[PDB]
C-alpha cells in the first residue's frame, strides 16, 4: 500500500528533476577558457606522526592545523614554520576524524570509540585538557564539525547524524534517514545547513535548526566517502568508491557534473574546493591527489607526493595552501 505511494512520489520527483534539466553545465561551460596546468609543489612536510594519518583540519587563521593519526596523537602544527604547537595524547588511538574550532579554542576528535572528545587548547595553566566527551552515538563516529564554541555536529556509523550542545553534552537534534553508514559531513558557510554522504550511496541535506532532511541526492554507484560544500553554499561535491566525484546543486536538486576518468579505478577518500571553488581537489586511493576543474571536469594537476593512500585533504580559508595527509604518516603543504 505505502510502497506504491512511495514509488509514485519517487517517479514524480524524478520527473520534476528531469524537467528542470534544460541545458547541462558541460554544454554551457565550453565558452570559458580551460584552467592551465596547475602545478603545486610541496612547501612543508610535517613529520612526527608514526602511524596512518586519518584526518586533518585547518584553522580559521589559515596557519595552524590539527592532524589525527592512529598512533594516538592529535598534533596541532604551525604550518608556516613547521613547528608543532601541541601534541594531545588521546584515550583511544582509533581516531577517524578531527575538527578545529573556528575560534581556535577547541579541537574535536573521535573514531571507533563512538565518542567525540573536545579539548580545550587555551587553558590558564598552559596545557591542553579534555573539555568534554560526547557520548550517545551507536556506531563509529566518522566526522565532526564545529558550528561554534558550543555546538558541534557529528556523523556516525549508526546511520545517524547528531547536533550537540558542548556545554551540557546532550544531543540537541538527531538527524535520521540515512540507510548506510554516514561517512562524511560538510557545514554550509552560514552554518544553517549541512550535507552528509552515507554508505547508502546517497547524500542528504539537513536543516540544523529544524532537524529534517530538506533534500536527498542520488547517483553514486558505491559508498560516498567525502563531501564538501561549494564556497557560496549553493552546491556540494561528493567523492565515492566508484572512482567518481559528482557535483550537486541544492536549488536544481540534481547532479550537474561528474569528475571521472577511465584511468582511475580507486575510490575517493577526500574532496575539497579552492577559495573560488574553481578547483575541486580530491584525494584518491591510488596514492595521489587529483586537481579537477569544477566547471568543466578536466584534470588540471596531480599532487603526487605521498607513498601511501591520501586519506585527508583541506584548503585554508584564505586559499593560500592545501594540506594532504596520508597513510604514510606525513602531511604536505602544497602551494
Amino acid at each position: 500500500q505505502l510502497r506504491q505511494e512511495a514509488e509514485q512520489l519517487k517517479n514524480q520527483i524524478r520527473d520534476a528533476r528531469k524537467a528542470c534539466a534544460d541545458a547541462t553545465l558541460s554544454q554551457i561551460t565550453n565558452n570559458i577558457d580551460p584552467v592551465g596546468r596547475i602545478q603545486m609543489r610541496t612547501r612543508r612536510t610535517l613529520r612526527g606522526h608514526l602511524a596512518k594519518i586519518y584526518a586533518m583540519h585547518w584553522g580559521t587563521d589559515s596557519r595552524l592545523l590539527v592532524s589525527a593519526s592512529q598512533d594516538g596523537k592529535l598534533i596541532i602544527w604551525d604550518s608556516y614554520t613547521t613547528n608543532k604547537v601541541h601534541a594531545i595524547p588521546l584515550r583511544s588511538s582509533w581516531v577517524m576524524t578531527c575538527a578545529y574550532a573556528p575560534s581556535g579554542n577547541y579541537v574535536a576528535c573521535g573514531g571507533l570509540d563512538n565518542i567525540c572528545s573536545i579539548y580545550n587548547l587555551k587553558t590558564r595553566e598552559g596545557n591542553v585538557r579534555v573539555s568534554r566527551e560526547l557520548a550517545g552515538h551507536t556506531g563509529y563516529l566518522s566526522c565532526c564539525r564545529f558550528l561554534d564554541d558550543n555546538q558541534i555536529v557529528t556523523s556516525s556509523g549508526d546511520t545517524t547524524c547528531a547536533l550537540w550542545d558542548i556545554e551540557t553534552g546532550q544531543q540537541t537534534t538527531t538527524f535520521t534517514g540515512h540507510t548506510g553508514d554516514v561517512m562524511s559531513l560538510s557545514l554550509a558557510p552560514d552554518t544553517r545547513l549541512f550535507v552528509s554522504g552515507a554508505c547508502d550511496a546517497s547524500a542528504k541535506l539537513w536543516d540544523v535548526r529544524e532537524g529534517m532532511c530538506r533534500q536527498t541526492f542520488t547517483g553514486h554507484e558505491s559508498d560516498i566517502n567525502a563531501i564538501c560544500f561549494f564556497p557560496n553554499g549553493n552546491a556540494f561535491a561528493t567523492g565515492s568508491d566508484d572512482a567518481t566525484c559528482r557535483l550537486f546543486d541544492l536549488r536544481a536538486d540534481q547532479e550537474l557534473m561528474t569528475y571521472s576518468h577511465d584511468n582511475i579505478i580507486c575510490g575517493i577518500t577526500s574532496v575539497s574546493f579552492s577559495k573560488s571553488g574553481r578547483l575541486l581537489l580530491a584525494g584518491y586511493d591510488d596514492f595521489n591527489c587529483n586537481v579537477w576543474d569544477a566547471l568543466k571536469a578536466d584534470r588540471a594537476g596531480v599532487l603526487a607526493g605521498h607513498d601511501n593512500r591520501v586519506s585527508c585533504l583541506g584548503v585554508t580559508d584564505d586559499g593560500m595552501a592545501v594540506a594532504t595527509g596520508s597513510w604514510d604518516s606525513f602531511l604536505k603543504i602544497w602551494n
Binding site: 505505502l2 510502497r3 505511494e5 512511495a6 512520489l9 519517487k10 514524480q12 520527483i13 520534476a16 528533476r17 528542470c20 534539466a21 534544460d22 541545458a23 547541462t24 553545465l25 554551457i28 561551460t29 570559458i32 584552467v35 596547475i38 603545486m40 612547501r43 612543508r44 596557519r63 604550518s79 608556516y80 534517514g177 529534517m212 532532511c213 530538506r214 533534500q215 536527498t216 561549494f230 564556497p231 557560496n232 549553493n234 552546491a235 546543486d249 536549488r251 536544481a252 536538486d253 540534481q254 550537474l256 579552492s274 577559495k275 573560488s276 571553488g277 574553481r278 578547483l279 569544477a294 566547471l295 584548503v315 584564505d318 586559499g319 593560500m320 595552501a321 592545501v322 603543504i333 602551494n335
Partner: protein, 50 residues
Amino acid sequence: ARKLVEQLKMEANIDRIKVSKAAADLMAYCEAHAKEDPLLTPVPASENPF
C-alpha cells in the same frame, strides 16, 4: 512506511530552478572570485607564506 511517505511528499513540494540558471550562477561565482584564489593564479613569492 508512513514516515518515509511523508518525507517524500515534503521533499517533492519544493521549488526547483532550471539547471541552466544554477550552472550560470555557479560560473558567475567562479569568475567573480577568480582573482582572490591563490591556487588558480599564483601569488608572488614575496606575499607567499610558504
